[PDB]
């Protein structure tokens, strides 16, 4: 009878809210900030740790740590702080009266999911819980039942093909290139113009620059020639202290790492080749149905040139008699949460919750037998 | 008073319909498909088994099984599924109000016919039923009363000679070489050009290739020399994913196994020698009447060179003073069903039905005393 | 008068040497490594491509490519580099004074053998050459004349039955599951414990882990229960940078894909069912003689549980009144080369060489008429 | 002075040996086996043709041909191979120092005997030779001088009456129904239980089944009722690959074709009616002497119910005042050879040999004037 | 034919000389001194700017400015003065007859290198010019071809890993903590004992104190407790005017900022953690070869405790099964110049010079395509 909770815990952003809603109620950056300097004023309240938007607002005197690195939770006390902020401070609910739906990247370690179940059942003891794959939730929110989902967030870029509600786990591809690596490459290539960003708050400044100014070029070499010829692609950004920086080719050399991973010294192929290799790893009779249903999800896929570029590259890779369609909804930054809210409100889902007596009987191993 | 049902249950295609019609109403492939992958999206309909055209439409995520192998039913639950799809889903009738005519290959095991009678009288309980030989039905649909019928389908190729309505059972020849063996041979010889087809859906793709592109050469050695000399016999086929394959001599090296079974390591003789041996096993005075009435039936005899080649080979085998005629009607793919509809509408056939009280009195053994 | 050369060119290892020897002189991995990073120091010799053990020794700065994939040569310049390293750098001989014996997998494309003939007669112009089937060479090295050979290497697992020196080509069954697929599956299941291997040098690291620590369980479910109960099956491996990884059930879940191909999403049956179906595809009177002479060959058949497991599975499949014997010699990793050395030293083989004038007269087609 | 040779050349077994012996030294099946598959292993001697027991031991890779079909030799090179195996390989003698006694069926073609004389005088040139009727040799081995011999072998069943050493050629009956037809009928009716035997080696397996398990029922309809009621007549046979088949009524349906030829679609009467018609075609005063001396010979008369059944059928046919006796010695499988050894050792037979000068003077026609 | 020039222009010292020499001919401080007071004595030679050792000798009446700050040139007229003093006053050569090799820190702005090329080709117009990375020159002077170079000078501390002459640019780390920051930290913490330094000449006095008296403690807490317990670590320095100062823990608290950057309010990690993170950012198989070849270079690495402390810290960070070696040659203060002299004297380097026609054709952008 009670309303479920959907808490998409990504590598860079936590999106929490209620099942059945259209948009997540709480979207906050998943950071924990701790003071690096010394406190000299007595009476003012300086907490030992700042979580979320409070860490971003006071980031000049804080060292910021991300508890999730490349989809895997590395700090567990910090993720306890993140979940405590998400439940009590933002959603303002008690977790013992609401089942909670959680998301997880494919090809993740089993200890991550087991400890997620253990913390969600013993610290904030929920009546029931479930772990879902983020790409299945993206396909749920897209409204279709077939397609290959390219989900690129802050730590993990993964391709999952699903045909008629059936997943093909041997064709699931995972690549550790996402928005944090693009941010770091922007820190590296911003020093070529003389702008130095070294601290963790400057990483957030560079991330804001990347979010507001970067774009994907349709042709990389023609854009390189155009940027070297004329200064028509240069844009100016105002720093928080007041300085104005100007960037030229770095607006499109930063997300080009998504298509040329060798820019950051990785042997892997681009996202278009990863998508094509995931399609040709499937059975032949479904491949056409995977060609016309390329679904984009995640915040890294929000550059304003990426759909046409992926369409052009996959059309160059696929045979010419096939129709290539890239499904890029405008709400695809939150599509994993929207699909989680769709799934948690279904009447056929209520018997697949992992309840507290099943966790008491089986221990933290029921999540490998009731979830994929 | 009620209309009878004719249900030709071949090894590869089930053709069902009403007595008195010209063409069968429901022609669907006799396969049962079961999901091999895992289902991850809930709410939409996932059945445990897909039967017929639905199994062909979703064959990329299914393992397809044929319930009938070489004319003998191996899976009986799958055969019940096939009959249930034929009666309720395709013909949309209740089997308890219609007598049913079924077909069977010659020299078949008795337990096959007994279990067919048992299921057709206890599961879909019909008022009456009958089992007929397919070659007699082919001769019924041809409009003649004498001739030798070469029926080649998906599992069984059989020659049956009938003179003036009198069958000669000692000259009936059965050879286990038909369209599935030709499909498997095409799958084997397609790997010489680098095309690999290993799954059960790829078997259906190769079967479509064989149906669309293969033909019987009039002279095998001259056609092999022509294919080795110039690329005028090469044809291109578009795969379901979009790739284009090209085949040369494999257009005629695949049905040549009908005339040279040693291509697939079989000691038996070709269909022309089987026909000649079945003719020469009969009485001498009828042999001339069997020479001018060679009736072709079944889907395997639909290659566009087989009548001239069969004519040439029998004319080489028979003495030169005899006229050799190959009767190849254009509707011979469905001629067994057409003859079943002709027989089931006859006024002299209505007293040869096996009724339900006779089955109750005699058990599943009346079919050996009322049917040939 | 001159000594012949035997060069087994498999998908993962090249084994070259002289005829009449007991062990191959040069066993090196068949890879070509090319530098991915940039060279900043001049003066030292930095070649454009590294072949063999030199590519393995410097693999941290190289992208490694296999020229042969699933028994089929895909890169021909790289294969020319492999053969040039085999002849001049390892064997240290001139190829124009020695005939060369080559091996090939069954059911291979004809263009592979034709281009092998063209390069072996026009680039390294040998006086004569021959292409042999690897399973025939394995039966030559076993010393027997009858038996079914399961040869599993790096790309191809094939069963070939030979009775009294007569092969049955219709019962030859080829399956594209071998040690590279097991290495990829070990990559996929090593991420469950948090170990990430993505690069091509990490493929060699995972392959060394598989070669050193994996084994075939006699009973998979009992070993699953034993590994889940106690940590007595866990083994530790030291990585090249000093980290120690620990693996438990992955020691026997990796070669279990040989018996359950559905672990990597393949519709095919296991190697035991492949062997049983190859035996039952033969004639009846030889089947008992194929039951007691199961010959194992190749490096993939070197797991220390595979003979007992294959014995148990085939004894479960075969009727109980036949004796099942699995012939697993300790030198079966090199048995194809040993059989090639036995064959090339035979006095009755010297008239079966494909000489250079026959190649000049017939062109790239004599290898289909003088070899099987 | 030299020892003569007796070589009974039946349609299914060649029995050769020396005159004056009690049992033939060499009994081997008269088949020629030729390899149907390809040879891949060079070094071992693979002969082009296998004759006799070597063809039976390696029959899984051979096509087997019988040189004699229905008493008449069709392949003469194969009979040269059979005689060369009989003289040099089995008897281990040279034919040029031994006269040879040969047997032939009654009512045979004259060119068969002429070519037998031509081959026995020009290829294996003997000092002398003779052709005798097999039934006269059976009467010689029985020790009597009067009686009617029913000789049924592998191709020909013939009744010959002889009274006081005087043959009656007008009452000699030849019927083309023997053990090969019974083997073919058993091969046909074994498919009713689902056992398929189509190759030539499977014909030998079915012949072994017929030899080991078949019997003649005293009453056919009572045995039908007994087999249909209870499974007390069912017997199990082990196939060479280990499968166990079970046969019921087919143990007595197969030799019932000897009494009801219409089971294989043949217009002729049974062996009992043939014997009665041969007796009634003779003079009346000898008929009683033919009633009490029915001599059985040949391997087809070795069923363990045939003497009582034949006695019952003739006693039903003959008048009740005549005594009916069926002489069935236990050595009647070899009785033709035993009678040939008795005849060739006689002192009064040495003047009836056809010598080489008589053959040179008269040409291939002396055998029609010196033999019956 | 003419001798090239090697001019290492560091942030605090300019080392110029000829190629092929073992030691640089001219080592002078890169400062420009301008008179802050007024001139009253006419006739005395008073220049407007003093460069090099003349600025150091008269620093009591001069304000000293460094043209290079943190590896980036800020004053270009002063840089021209430094180069003019380096060529005409110290080396006493004409730059138009000698090619010049220059050094630059990694991750530097492109405009710095472009203006370096422009001044090098238009003000002191050289026949040819090259710009090289200083860590590659340190590895050149070490005599090895693999290793990770930690170069710490006056403005920039950078780690560059090189394996077999191949650099890994994604693992190159740059940290803006060097000897000028340590001089400022000692300048700050010398006020705790009552010694006040505020001016630019007093900065040179503090730099001399740091060069002569500071050292790196192996254990910081134990040395702090030892200095607090007994005054055995105190040392006395004589000021230029005559006063004697005494320092205690400041001998090891000043270079401890190299290992604890938070002493100067910097969020970055120490040089040992920077070295470890640069090693683990490389590929796995080279990491061992980077562990045993830690090459120290630059004047900041000349403290007499830094090799053992770096060895201890990296051994604490690395896994315990590996050998850690710190290569600290005694000539590592000038190792960049020695490597530049080695590189410029190589015969394989003479085609990598950027000549004057290439600069005239391409403009000041050829230095990004011919240099790294
Ligand atoms: N407008 C934008 N353009 C490009 N990148 C964006 C934009 N908005 C967000 N991002 C990137 O998306 C990443 C997070 O996306 P999302 O998947 O929603 O969060 P998470 O990865 O934590 O689940 C951030 O690292 C950010 O850099
Ligand atoms: N046009 C065609 N050319 C060649 N083969 C065909 C053609 N149409 C059908 N076939 C073959 O006929 C086989 C089945 O024929 P049919 O006798 O109608 O069905 P069944 O054997 O099930 O009774 C199929 O295996 C198919 O490969
Ligand atoms: N001791 C071992 N245990 C298990 N697998 C092994 C072992 N040694 C080698 N292999 C596997 O054998 C494969 C190659 O074997 P082999 O057949 O000799 O080479 P190729 O396939 O090139 O002919 C490699 O992929 C390797 O993974
Ligand atoms: N014990 C037996 N029971 C039934 N049939 C037998 C038996 N022994 C031999 N036969 C049959 O007798 C036939 C040959 O008998 P025989 O006359 O000895 O040889 P041939 O006809 O060649 O002279 C064979 O086909 C065999 O099937
Ligand atoms: N013996 C020493 N002990 C400590 N620091 C030193 C020593 N010698 C030189 N330094 C420091 O090294 C810095 C410059 O070193 P170097 O790298 O040779 O010059 P640059 O940085 O200009 O290339 C100076 O700031 C100086 O303080
Ligand atoms: Mg996400
Ligand atoms: Mg049919
Ligand atoms: Mg191999
Ligand atoms: Mg006989
Ligand atoms: Mg320096």
Swiss-Prot record, chains A, B, C, D, E:
Disulfide bonds: none annotated. The modification Methionine (R)-sulfoxide is found at residues 41, 44. It comes from the Eukaryota. It catalyses: ATP + H2O = ADP + phosphate + H(+). It is linked to Visceral myopathy 1: An autosomal dominant form of myopathic pseudo-obstruction characterized by impaired function of enteric smooth muscle cells, resulting in abnormal intestinal motility, severe abdominal pain, malnutrition, and even death. The disease shows inter- and intrafamilial variability. Most severely affected patients exhibit prenatal bladder enlargement, intestinal malrotation, neonatal functional gastrointestinal obstruction, and dependence on total parenteral nutrition and urinary catheterization. The keyword Ribonucleoprotein does not apply. In the intestine, abundantly expressed in smooth muscle cells of muscularis mucosa and muscularis propria. Also detected in intestinal vascular smooth muscle cells. This is Actin, gamma-enteric smooth muscle. In vertebrates 3 main groups of actin isoforms, alpha, beta and gamma have been identified. The alpha actins are found in muscle tissues and are a major constituent of the contractile apparatus. The beta and gamma actins coexist in most cell types as components of the cytoskeleton and as mediators of internal cell motility. There is a cross-link at residue 47 (Isoglutamyl lysine isopeptide (Lys-Glu) (interchain with E-271)). Belongs to the actin family. GO terms for biological process: mesenchyme migration; positive regulation of gene expression. Transmembrane segments: none annotated. It comes from Homo sapiens (Human). The modification Tele-methylhistidine is found at residue 70. Its EC number is 3.6.4.-. Keywords: Acetylation, ATP-binding, Cytoplasm, Cytoskeleton, Disease variant, Hydrolase, Isopeptide bond, Methylation, Muscle protein, Nucleotide-binding, Oxidation.
């Amino acid at each position: 009878e009670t309303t479920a909770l959907v808490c998409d815990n990504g590598s860079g952003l936590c999106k929490a809210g209620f099942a059945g809603d259209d948009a997540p109620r709480a979207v906050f950056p998943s950071i924990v900030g701790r003071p690096r300097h010394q406190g000299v004023m007595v009476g003012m309240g300086q907490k030992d740790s700042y979580v979320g938007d409070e860490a971003q607002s006071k980031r000049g005197i804080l060292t910021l740590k991300y508890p999730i690195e490349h989809g895997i939770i590395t700090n567990w006390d910090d993720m306890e702080k993140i979940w405590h902020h998400s439940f009590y401070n933002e959603l303002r609910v008690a977790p013992e009266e609401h089942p909670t739906l959680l998301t997880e990247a494919p090809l993740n370690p089993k200890a991550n999911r087991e400890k997620m179940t253990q913390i969600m059942f013993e610290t904030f003891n929920v009546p029931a819980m479930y772990v879902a794959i983020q790409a299945v939730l993206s396909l749920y929110a897209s409204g279709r039942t077939t397609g290959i989902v390219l989900d690129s967030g802050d730590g993990v870029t993964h391709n999952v093909p699903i045909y008629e509600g059936y997943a093909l786990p041997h064709a699931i591809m995972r690549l550790d290139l996402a928005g944090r690596d693009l941010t770091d490459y922007l820190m590296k290539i911003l020093t070529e113009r003389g702008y130095s960003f070294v601290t963790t708050a400057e990483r957030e400044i560079v991330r804001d620059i990347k979010e507001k100014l970067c774009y994907v070029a349709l042709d990389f070499e023609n854009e390189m020639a155009t940027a070297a010829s004329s200064s028509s692609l240069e844009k100016s950004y105002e720093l928080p202290d007041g300085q104005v920086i100007t960037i030229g080719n770095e607006r499109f050399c930063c997300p080009e790492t998504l298509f040329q991973p060798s820019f950051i010294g990785m042997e892997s192929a681009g996202i278009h080749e990863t998508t094509y290799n995931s399609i040709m790893k499937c059975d032949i009779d479904i491949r056409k149905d995977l060609y016309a249903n390329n679904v984009l999800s995640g915040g890294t896929t929000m550059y304003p040139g990426i759909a046409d570029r992926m369409q052009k590259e996959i059309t160059a890779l696929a045979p010419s008699t096939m129709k290539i369609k890239i499904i890029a909804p405008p709400e695809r930054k939150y599509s994993v949460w929207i699909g989680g809210s769709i799934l948690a409100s279904l009447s056929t889902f209520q018997q697949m919750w992992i309840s507290k007596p099943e966790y008491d009987e089986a221990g933290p191993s029921i999540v490998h037998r009731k979830c994929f």
